[PDB]
Amino acid sequence: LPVPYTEAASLSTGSTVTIKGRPLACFLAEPYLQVDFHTEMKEESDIVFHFQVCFGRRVVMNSREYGAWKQQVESKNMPFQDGQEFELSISVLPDKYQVMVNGQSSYTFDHRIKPEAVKMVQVWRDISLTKFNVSYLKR
Amino acid sequence: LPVPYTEAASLSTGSTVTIKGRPLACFLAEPYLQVDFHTEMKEESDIVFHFQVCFGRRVVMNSREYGAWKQQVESKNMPFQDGQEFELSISVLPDKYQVMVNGQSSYTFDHRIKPEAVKMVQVWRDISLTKFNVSYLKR
């Protein structure tokens, strides 16, 4: 899959975004992974959910609203494993996103903007990607 | 050119490393560029010169010696232009590296390890690359 990876998308309660991929360097090099849920197809559009991994160090989550970054949430939780493929599953719950890493609940982020505002998902920085899916099974 | 880009290399006084490329996102997204001069072909080897651009924000330079990062040099100088191709030229002078951006002297970094210790150059993070060259014209 090409990285940066972009897909038009819609989200609501019950939606799951599944990403399978792979850092491009060992953790000692501090590769990054970024997943952004955008309100428009344009990359300068607002970001309802920003998820940024500095592999082996930290994760930051935030939103970008009317062009400006808001209060970041910083986590030191690091379930990702050096040199390994990862499977990332972001579920849209009524009150928050829930982020699973290799099947383990690892982060959550309460909705600041309704998920129905999302029109695009971008996955980029220092990863390769073998799978991307947005589920569309629920009303 | 594939990114991450790796080339075996040797450097001495008079050597020039010329990199031509292009951020993968606008500056608002804060794409990065990293150029590392390594002592071995392995990515965990020491880094004689680390050059890391956070486009539109800062540049940091450092060395990684026996596995540990040393004193970083942080610069707010930012000659790179939003959305534009750049031409980066790193010259090996007797006392320092000199970094030109689009023909303009922009950064320098005094040698901490002799440049003759370099065996590999890696260029990676959020850029595309159209040209890479190491000059080999001087004794």
Side-chain angles (χ1 to χ4, degrees), chain B residues 48-56 58-59:
Chain B
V48 165
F49 181 46
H50 158 82
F51 176 81
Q52 190 184 82
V53 180
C54 180
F55 281 108
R58 57 168 200 180
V59 169

Side-chain angles (χ1 to χ4, degrees), chain A residues 19 35 38 41 65 73 91 103 109 137:
Chain A
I19 303 164
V35 177
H38 279 268
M41 297 291 305
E65 310 181 23
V73 177
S91 297
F109 184 88
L137 307 192

